[PDB]
Structure 1
Amino acid sequence: MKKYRVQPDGRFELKRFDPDDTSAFEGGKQAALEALAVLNRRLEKLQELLYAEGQHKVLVVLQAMDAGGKDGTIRVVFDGVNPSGVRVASFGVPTEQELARDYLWRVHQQVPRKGELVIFNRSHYEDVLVVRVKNLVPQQVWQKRYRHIREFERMLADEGTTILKFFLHISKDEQRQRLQERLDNPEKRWKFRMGDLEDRRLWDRYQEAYEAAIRETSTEYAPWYVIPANKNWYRNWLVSHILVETLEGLAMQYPQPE
């Protein structure tokens, strides 16, 4: 089941992962939806424990190509989970205030507190992704940032944060369909930006960047999971299974005051 966990050997190659792979589930969509429903209930209970224990901090990082399933994952995986204990932090185009400080400043501000589960919809990884691909800074600058991230995450983990980093892996062809579906969708007509067409020619450069990022930052304290995300049902089930298992591993207990 950890066939998707990227080992900290620095020997990662994205070619080994197929976006269309569904080998960890034996049953197809209908069966998987039932399985997800079970895990969602366990997740709801596990969050209730987390909030009650108030010791651990859970950080779920979502990274994907545009239309890679970031919003869809949050919406389906965290369906019915208490709003008081779960929070989404999105990282968009940096403001002048954000650029006036190091790139980790805006990110560090949003980290989960004790008893809180935080989802990062894009993250500090963007500073080794869009920044690298579009050469917003030279290689000399962004190359050093891998060490920064390893060390920043070491600090977070050592101080009590459970870090789960999910790479939602979709094919170039799947993305083409999803963006075309976005353009014909009336309630998604607004989600489209013109820049989505320029980043499309940069596909390979983005894939190279994801390969580099994952190889350099997947550690035992902060592992990367490559989720085959072409099938939404499989993506949702697998992300739920990984999170539920990790949270189960924490052996969280309800406190007693006497």
Structure 2
Amino acid sequence: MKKYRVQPDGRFELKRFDPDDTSAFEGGKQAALEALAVLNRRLEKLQELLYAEGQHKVLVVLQAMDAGGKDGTIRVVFDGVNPSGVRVASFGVPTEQELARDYLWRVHQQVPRKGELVIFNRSHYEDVLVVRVKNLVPQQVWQKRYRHIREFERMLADEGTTILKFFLHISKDEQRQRLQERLDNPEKRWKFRMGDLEDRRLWDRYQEAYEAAIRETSTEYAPWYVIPANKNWYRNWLVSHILVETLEGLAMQYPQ
């Protein structure tokens, strides 16, 4: 499943990843739901080990186009995980207080502590994405942020944080179907804003911004994983597989 890890050679091309790809799973939706339940139980036990050992900090970053599956991945992948050891930090439009300090200030505040698993629903990457696409700061400014991000993540990793960054990759036509479904569902209509159509008009600019951010910041200590996410069953299974394998690799143990 290492075909999805972006190597730190700065040669990443987003066109090489197909949102409809399900090739790492030898089966379909029904078999993947059973495989996901097994990974989910392993995840609950690994979180239990993480919290009791109280040494490692785990940061899961989720980035995607609107309707790309950030909310759904949190809901399904972390289903049943002890609320005491899992925390979500969601990053929306910056406030005046947040904009009064550097862009990393509000993000650094939310990092996981020892024994905790934190999920960033959007993150510091927004400062090289919506910021670049909507020209909120000139290129001279946002271009310097790729190095800031690599170095901030290097500091976090060196100091004990296991970092996993997932780009949930959906196609333009899939986003269209999802935004239409969001509009037609009375229990989902609340998620839709008029500004989401303007973000959709800028699809190509966002894909370019994502490709540049991933190419610049996928490192050995903070890898990006590109997740084909047109199939939610595949997205949830693959994210759970990578997360479980990473946590198993920490070789955690209940204290003496």
Q: TM-score of the superposition, structure 2-length normalised?
A: 1.00
- Note the alpha carbon deviations across 1:28-60, whole angstroms, 9 max, x for none: 000000000000000000000000000000000
Q: Which runs of 4+ in 1 moved over 3 A?
A: none
Q: Deviations over 1:155-196 (max 9, x none)?
A: 000000000000000000000000000001111111111100
Q: Distance in 1 between matches of 2:189 and 2:140?
A: 39
Structure 1 unaligned residues grouped into runs of 5+:
none
Mapped to 1, the partners of 2:99 and 2:127 lie a distance apart of 11
Q: Structure 2: give runs of 5+ residues left out of the alignment.
A: none
Deviations 1:120-178 (A, max 9, x none): 00000000000000000000000000000000000000000000000000000000000
Q: What is the match of residue 174 of structure 1?
A: 174
Using the alignment, how far apart are the partners of 1:184 and 1:202 within structure 2? 23
Residue 175 (structure 2) pairs with residue 212 (structure 1): no
Counterpart in 2 of 1:119? 119
Match of 1:105 in 2: 105
Kindly tell me the number of residue pairs found equivalent between the two proteins: 256
Partner Cα distance (2:14, 2:27) in 1: 26
Q: C-alpha root-mean-square deviation of aligned residues, in Å? A: 0.3
State the distance in 2 between where 1:11 and 1:27 align. Answer: 31
Supply the distance in 1 between the matched residues of 2:123 and 2:20 (Cα, whole angstroms). Answer: 25
In structure 2, distance between residues paired with 1:102 and 1:168: 27
Query: Whole-Å Cα distance in 2 between the matches of residues 116 and 219 of structure 1?
Result: 23
Aligned residue for 1:21, secondary structure, equals: coil
The equivalent of 1:139 in structure 2 is 139
Structure 2 match to 1:4: 4
Structure 2 CA distance for aligned equivalents of residues 110 and 246 of structure 1: 21
TM-score normalised to the size of structure 1?
0.99
> What is the rounded CA distance, in whole Å, between the counterparts of 2:117 and 2:250 in structure 1?
13
* Per-residue deviation, 1:88: 0.2
Q: Which residue of 1 aligns with 2:239?
A: 239
Q: CA deviation at 1:100?
A: 0.1
Deviation at 1:81, TM superposition (A): 0.2
Superposition deviation, residue 83 in structure 1: 0.2
Deviation at 1:113, TM superposition (A): 0.1
| Cα offset, 1:200, TM superposition | 0.8
Secondary structure of 1:222's aligned partner: coil
**Distance in 1 of aligned mates of 2:32 and 2:127:** 35
**Aligned partners of 1:115, 1:149: CA distance in 2, in Å?**
23
